[PDB]
């Protein structure tokens, strides 16, 4: 059956979606800050 021996590691290429979401959250925080700063004005 060719048993899947997944004794591998997690490099930057193996896991980048979490960092992508973190960047998306940073962008979401930045525009919300900008929107609030414009809303006071």
């Amino acid at each position: 059956e060719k048993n899947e021996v997944m004794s591998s590691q997690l490099d930057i290429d193996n896991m980048a979606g979490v960092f992508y979401m973190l960047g998306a959250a940073m962008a979401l925080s930045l525009i919300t800050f900008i929107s609030e700063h414009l809303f006071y004005w």
Partner: protein
């Protein structure tokens, strides 16, 4: 027993135990003599009192942790990236907090640095609406990181099977040998004759006798010090040799179904009397009692691949890390005293 033949007298005679038996001075064989068509020609055997065979033998060692250090599962660049990301998100929280219309930067960095490694100190948490929507996702990120960490280290701790035990004769030993492990037997033996008998077993015997041994105890010793990896011999012999030291265990399955038997002289009433008595003895727990008493001393197997316990050899990395942290704190107390 040997049917040695020569052209000096053009006749073949039995020389050995069977020779002394046929000579007339001996009466009956009570030694563990195997059965076959060759020895059945001159003399006749009786009903067997055992069922022996040929099984492979291999050294057995405790399983071992296999984990070098704690930094194994992800990367070094992964830890570096997550650290720089902690710093970047802390300074970004500070920027978004003070700009909007109170996290002093130190307190925000403490909050960040605490909410990734699950606790620590430092009450205080952003009151700026930009930061409040930022952290939540940072706590989510830390949760995802921690969850990915234990799954990955537990997945690596359950897919480590370095045994690859030989299950029998249908193993790559029959297909093609290699230079990693070796397998052979003692020269001038019945197992060697049975190997030279068959067709594929002939090539197997050639590949084995390329580097075969010439002793049983020497082969046992070589297996004990990893000189020779596996040798085939009689089942009962290695079965006794395994349960007496509790260092190596047997393997494979017995296929050659030739058992021992009392060797009687041709055409004697003691032959028939003997077969009826050995079969009666086989029924009344007698043979089982003798087996459990004489050859099977204690069940020291403890086999079936008990899983990896972790051990004071891999967490040593974390202990060295916390010791280095102790040293760093011993330096940092004086550094902070000077700074103050």
């Amino acid at each position: 027993g040997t049917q040695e033949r020569v052209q000096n007298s053009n006749k073949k005679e039995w020389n050995g135990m069977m020779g002394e038996l046929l000579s007339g001075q001996a009466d009956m064989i009570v030694a563990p003599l195997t059965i076959n068509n060759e020895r059945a020609q001159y003399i006749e055997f009786s009903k067997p009192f055992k069922y022996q065979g040929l099984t492979i033998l291999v050294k057995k060692e405790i399983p071992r942790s296999t984990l070098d250090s704690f930094m194994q599962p992800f990367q070094s660049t992964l830890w570096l990236l997550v650290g720089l990301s902690v710093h970047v998100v802390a300074v970004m929280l500070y920027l978004l907090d003070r700009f909007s219309p109170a996290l002093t930067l130190s307190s925000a960095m403490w909050f960040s640095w605490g909410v990734l490694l699950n606790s620590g100190i430092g009450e205080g948490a952003p009151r700026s609406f930009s930061a409040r929507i930022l952290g939540m996702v940072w706590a989510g990120f830390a949760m995802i990181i921690v969850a990915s960490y234990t799954a990955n280290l537990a997945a690596f701790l359950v897919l480590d099977r370095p045994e690859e035990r030989i299950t029998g004769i249908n193993d790559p030993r029959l297909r093609n040998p290699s230079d990693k492990f070796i397998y052979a037997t003692v020269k001038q033996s019945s197992v060697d004759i049975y190997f030279r008998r068959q067709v594929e077993l002939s090539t197997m015997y050639r590949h084995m006798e390329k580097h075969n041994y010439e002793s049983a105890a020497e082969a046992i010793q070589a297996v004990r010090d990893n000189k020779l990896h596996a040798f085939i011999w009689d089942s009962a012999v290695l079965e006794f040799e395994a349960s007496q030291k509790c260092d190596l265990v047997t393997t494979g399955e017995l296929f050659f179904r030739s058992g021992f038997g009392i060797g009687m002289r041709k055409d004697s009433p003691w032959k028939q009397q003997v077969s009826l008595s050995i079969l009666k003895s086989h029924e009344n727990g007698f043979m089982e009692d003798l087996d459990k008493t004489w050859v099977r001393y204690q069940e020291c197997d403890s086999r079936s691949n008990a899983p990896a316990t972790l051990t004071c050899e891999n967490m040593a990395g974390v202990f060295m890390l916390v010791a280095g942290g102790i040293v760093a704190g011993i330096f940092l107390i004086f550094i902070e005293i000077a700074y103050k």
